[PDB]
From a paper:
The structure of MEPL displays a typical α/β trypsin—like serine protease fold. It consists of two six-stranded β-barrels (β1–β6 and β7–β12), either of which makes up about one half of the entire molecule. Superimposing of MEPL with the bovine enteropeptidase light chain resulted in an rmsd of 0.79 Å for the Ca coordinates. The differences are mainly located in the loop regions, such as the so-called ‘131-loop’ that connects strand β7 and β8. MEPL also contains, relative to bovine enzyme, an additional small 310-helix between the strand β4 and β5. Compared with BEPL and HEPL, MEPL shows much less activity for the peptide substrates with arginine at P1 site, which indicates its restriction for the entrance of arginine residues. In MEPL structure, MEPLE136 makes three hydrogen bonds with MEPLR213, while there are no similar interactions in BEPL because it is BEPLL213, BEPLY136 in these positions as well as the same situation for the HEPL structure. In addition, MEPLV209 and MEPLG210 with short side chains are covered and fixed by the side chains of four residues (MEPLE136, MEPLE163, MEPLR213 and MEPLR216), reducing the mobility of “208-loop” and strand β11 in MEPL. Moreover, we observed that the imidazole group of MEPLH24 could form a hydrogen bond with the main chain oxygen atom of MEPLG185, which could help improving the structural rigidity of “174-loop”. Over all, the unique residue interactions in MEPL may reduce the flexibility of the specific pocket, restricting the entrance of arginine residue which has larger side chain.
Residue numbers in the entry: 795 to 814, 816 to 956, 956A, 957 to 968, 968A, 969 to 970, 970A, 970B, ...
Amino acid sequence: VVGGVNAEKGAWPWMVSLHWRGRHGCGASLIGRDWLLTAAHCVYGKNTHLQYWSAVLGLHAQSSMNSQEVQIRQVDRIIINKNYNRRTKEADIAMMHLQQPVNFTEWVLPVCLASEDQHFPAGRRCFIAGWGRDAEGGSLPDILQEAEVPLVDQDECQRLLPEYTFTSSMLCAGYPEGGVDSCQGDSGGPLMCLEDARWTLIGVTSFGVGCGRPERPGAYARVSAFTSWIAETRR
């Protein structure tokens, strides 16, 4: 995340770091005792020797993987949305089953998911979090970062990212002048909006042209478009 600040401990208790072969490689969101939501491109090609994965929850600093605030689980199952197209970025969304359930604590707790016609209009200020790059060309922060970014209207998303076919299963967010964005390493993590005083997961960090660039808002898989698939894959 570029243009953000250190998150406090327990700030985003659904935020998870996906370690693979011992290293953070993507983020994800806890959506229940047993299930994670992430980006498909995070798990594509890694749906084989699952013991390489470790879901790290309640994490603040990567250097403090060992705190008793931290819960860590093996990943048992990976379910990539059937419409995923790695070339076009459509349906870049997947679910991961935790091998043993997590306990809900101060530091670990699922997020509510955006519904069908819950309204999230352009201009709305939402939050992103992750352990991704500080900037395009910055370093990787030890401590989890958070930033506030505004949602951008669908038509603008597509004008600004003509390199892609921007669909109804995507959203985008960022500032015209740039400076605040999700970057490499943030993929799979959350875009969450405060809605009637309740944190709700709206997007899954998916792709972008660079990070934090002027008129290049980051793009996110739109949670509300995958409601039924998410529901059915549960447990």
